[PDB]
Design a protein around this nucleic acid. Structure first.
Lengths: 131, 388, 73
RNA sequence: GUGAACAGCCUCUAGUUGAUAGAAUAAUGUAGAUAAGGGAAGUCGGCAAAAUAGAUCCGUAACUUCGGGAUAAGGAUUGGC
RNA sequence: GCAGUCAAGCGUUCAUAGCGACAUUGCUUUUUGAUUCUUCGAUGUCGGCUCUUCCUAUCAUACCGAAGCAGAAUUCGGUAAGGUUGGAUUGUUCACCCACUAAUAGGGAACGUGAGCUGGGUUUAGACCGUCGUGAGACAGGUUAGUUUUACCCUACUGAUGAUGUUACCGCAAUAGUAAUUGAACUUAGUACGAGAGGAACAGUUCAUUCGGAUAAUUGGUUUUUGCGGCGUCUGAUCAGGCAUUGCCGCGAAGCUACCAUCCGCUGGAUUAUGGCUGAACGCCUCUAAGUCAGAAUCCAUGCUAGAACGCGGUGAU
RNA sequence: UUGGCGGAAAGGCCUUGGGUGCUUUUGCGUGGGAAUCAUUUGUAUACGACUUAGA
């Protein structure tokens, strides 16, 4: 979809991120974004709402050393809204989806941005907090 | 491909070639909108000066977003746009070889304005005593009119000689910037007539543009001076530790061709280029007073356009103004010329206007919003603050 | 009109402005300016003397000491 | 002379203002700092540079010719008075 | 390397949806060889970076044909030159390999690119090992270390200046370059199409990539204007200062640009492949032969910048 | 003198009627009626330029 707002890209490939749910995963490493395209010597970067492929560095064992996709829920770098306000989170975090959409965990921990929630209604259903 | 694997678009466009100094201080519009609608009460263009920028809050529209509805902020450039003297009707005819002017029809009164026509426009600033404008040649409007009769027997798309009266506020400068503005409208005979009625008198921004309407802005950019490849074209610096030349291109061209092409990125001039930025929504046309301002609450509250202290290095606005969407080329205290959108088209885009909540005005940045905080700070100072 | 409110400076945040921080503990902060935001990271309290921002009350000084006192009948 | 961890600044020793100046301050360049947030993705190579830093207390692994490894590691503390 | 012809044959049956041997004719010059024309009073090597311009044998996008095209993923092919990631291993080119993508094409420009960079390999001088050699020492054997000169005369071009001519402005426009790309998603539709499973189009809608231009409200960064904390040392003291990086150290502004901060980007006319019209030669048939309609991201126009030495006119004139 | 046409401007001209006649420059002379600089500065800018104020 349209995320319907614009953010500047926090995370290049090789970034260290929190895993937002209790899938077992404590920590992701970002391998690719599902839908970026780029220029020479030059990194693809992801931001809030993107579908990412990641590996879980810390994480299930089965998920460890595995690649599974995740959608980035929170980011340290600023998001710019339609109202105009800048919104940020403490941390960088995502929860582990498949590119298929298939699972890995029950609940979330910590907040999600309303924009991520619109895009992926199945993540949003497991949300404590929407901001 | 001999190289690169791994090949990227070339940074910096060839159409905005040459990257060179403008011929004139003031932008000149090469073509204009077509004769679709009403007569030469409709001047094709108007001019102004860029004051700075402000931000406004508006009632939006784009139903598809969820973020759609309520007030939403949008950026504005404020331009002070004084009443302009259409001095004369110049007649340009279409033939083969090109246009050549038949006439210019003069009004009785340009007086300081012709002195400003003498300033750079002739040259020398009160230098040695005159410069001259020849007087209306013992009522020989007949000369001008017989020459008017000549323009009606064919067809430029009827055009007018104009100036901006700069003296109004922000500019220390007095001198007028003369302009050629095209007139567009209905049938040709009435077109000459309306153009004729207009020269007799000044013309406001209210006559030319409606609010919200799509206006093309043409102006001349900020001038850097002389600059290298990296800022100009947007090319990278070469990192290394060491380089014989650090911020460089590797090769201007190749062993064949032997010549540094024009197409390649080079140091040279930057800024002070003409540029046309298209389809700007004209959020507000007005005066500081007394067209009006803001309602109160509500729709939303009354706010003078300037920020306190003035816009940096401009001064203060207090006269006609035009608020234009987004950016407009130039720095500040430069001529910007406004044109109705040449480009028919039509597509979607802004399809409904945008009801004025706020200007800004600020009164902010460690205080604000105007009426009450200024009173609040004044109790607390008191002496140096205003009132006593 | 809008306005927002500064959970640091205390002052009203003017409409179409401020930055929102969402923290891990899920507390929500509104910072009027970047001046405001920096100091919150630094863990400078606002009561402490940040502009001095959040102070600006009143109340205060003595009248009358002399003797903080006891015994002396 | 204060520091003695190196550094810096001094004072009655004493010594000097190098053989070019003036006006400005653009890119390019050469020394140089700081950078959003991310964090080796860059480069042959983490090259540099940042980084860590004094000292006290507590603590300290594999291995080992028991001498060492060892300031391992990790953490805490320190003012002005 | 690629193409053409022929078409044995296979594809359930069917040469030609697709695949296609033997044979055979070509074409290109980008691998390799061959040569010895050029340079031994000297052409800097591979590779990589970055900047440019190109090519068509087109990987994707546009338009189209065929199908063994039900949808639909698709396969093959025509027209067509207006984007083609980021990484790990390796010096590598090449390639392997991973997630991406619409798809991550191939080729040339002295294997484009050292009076630009790099210097990892090749390819000096020291050294080790395997191997060979009586030995010195040698290997298209491996390995560690091992330098990058020059102040531009001419030309080429970014940019700036710049007279003849009756003068200053303002304009014209011969012309030059020439920006729009692409995706996702919604409606349309869980519809068409289909046993079902699955699963389209068209347009209207919104948003994002990628590019370009621009701006400095917003908000980031800067901040060596200035003001304040606190470190040593110094002028008796505090107070006031000095030096310690070019700002001592910590704290922030205007201006200046960017953290995708923030704003703005088609239709006609002509055509290609083709699909059609009217239509003969050849009474029929035939999309072309004469004629003609449509039809590409094409062409041109539209759009912009530059533009009086195309050897310029007004106007405004002493 | 009258005037049109062209082409818009210029030009360039071309027509119907009456008063006199034919058959590129280069000065010696006569008659007729403004820039650039300094100086302040920029909306600039390397030098120049432009831009700007002046009882």
């Amino acid at each position: 979809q349209g995320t319907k707002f614009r953010i500047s890209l926090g995370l290049p490939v090789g970034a260290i991120m929190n895993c937002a749910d209790n899938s077992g995963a404590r920590n992701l490493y970002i391998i690719a974004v599902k839908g970026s395209g780029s220029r020479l010597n030059r990194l693809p970067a992801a931001s809030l709402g993107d579908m990412v492929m990641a590996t879980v560095k810390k994480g299930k064992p089965e998920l460890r050393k595995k690649v599974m996709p995740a959608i980035v829920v929170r980011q340290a770098k600023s998001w710019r809204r339609r109202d105009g306000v800048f919104l940020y989170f403490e941390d960088n975090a995502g929860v582990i989806a498949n590119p298929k959409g298939e699972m890995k965990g029950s609940a979330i921990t910590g907040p999600v941005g309303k924009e991520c929630a619109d895009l992926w209604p199945r993540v949003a259903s497991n949300s404590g907090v929407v901001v | 491909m001999s190289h690169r694997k791994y090949e990227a678009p070339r940074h910096g466009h060839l159409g905005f070639l040459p990257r060179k100094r403008a011929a004139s201080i003031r932008a000149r519009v090469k073509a204009f909108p077509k004769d679709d609608r009403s007569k030469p009460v409709a001047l094709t263009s108007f001019l102004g000066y860029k004051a700075g920028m402000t931000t406004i809050v508006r009632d939006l529209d784009r139903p598809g977003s969820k973020f759609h509805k309520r007030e939403v902020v949008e950026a504005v450039t404020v331009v002070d746009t004084p009443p302009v003297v259409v001095v004369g009707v110049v007649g340009y005819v279409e033939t083969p070889r090109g246009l050549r002017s038949l006439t210019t029809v003069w009004a009785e009164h340009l007086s300081d304005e012709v002195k400003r026509r003498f300033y750079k426009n002739w040259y020398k600033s009160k230098k040695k005593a005159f410069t001259k404008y020849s007087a209306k040649y013992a009522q020989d409007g007949a000369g001008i009119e017989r020459e008017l009769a000549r323009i009606k027997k064919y067809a430029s798309v009827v055009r007018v000689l104009v100036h901006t009266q700069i003296r109004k506020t922000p500019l220390a400068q007095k001198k007028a910037h003369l302009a050629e503005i095209q007139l567009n409208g209905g049938s040709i005979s009435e077109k000459v007539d309306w153009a004729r009625e207009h020269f007799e008198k000044t013309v406001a921004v209210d006559s030319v543009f409606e609010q919200n309407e799509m206006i093309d802005a043409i102006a001349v950019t900020k001038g850097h001076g002389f600059e290298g490849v990296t800022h100009r074209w947007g090319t990278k610096k070469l990192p290394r530790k060491t380089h014989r030349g650090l911020r460089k291109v590797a090769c201007i061209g190749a062993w064949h061709p032997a010549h540094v092409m024009w197409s390649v990125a080079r140091a040279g001039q930057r800024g002070y280029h003409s540029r046309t930025s298209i389809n700007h929504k004209i959020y507000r046309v007005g005066k500081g007073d007394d067209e009006a301002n803001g309602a109160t609450s509500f729709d939303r509250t009354k706010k003078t356009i300037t920020p306190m202290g003035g816009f940096v290095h401009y001064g203060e606005i207090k006269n006609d103004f035009i608020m234009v969407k987004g950016c407009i080329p130039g720095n500040r205290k430069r001529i910007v010329t406004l044109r109705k959108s040449l480009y028919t088209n039509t597509s979607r885009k802004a399809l409904e206007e945008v009801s004025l909540k706020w200007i800004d005005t600020a009164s902010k940045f460690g205080k604000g919003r105007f009426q009450t905080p200024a009173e609040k700070h004044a109790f607390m100072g008191t002496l140096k603050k205003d009132l006593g | 009109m809008k306005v927002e409110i500064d959970s640091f400076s205390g002052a009203k945040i003017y409409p179409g402005r401020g930055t929102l921080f969402v923290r891990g503990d899920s507390k929500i902060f509104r910072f009027q300016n970047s001046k405001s935001a920096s100091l919150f990271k630094q863990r400078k309290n606002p009561r402490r003397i940040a502009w001095t921002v959040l102070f600006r009350k009143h109340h205060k000084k003595g009248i009358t000491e002399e003797v903080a006192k006891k015994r002396s009948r």
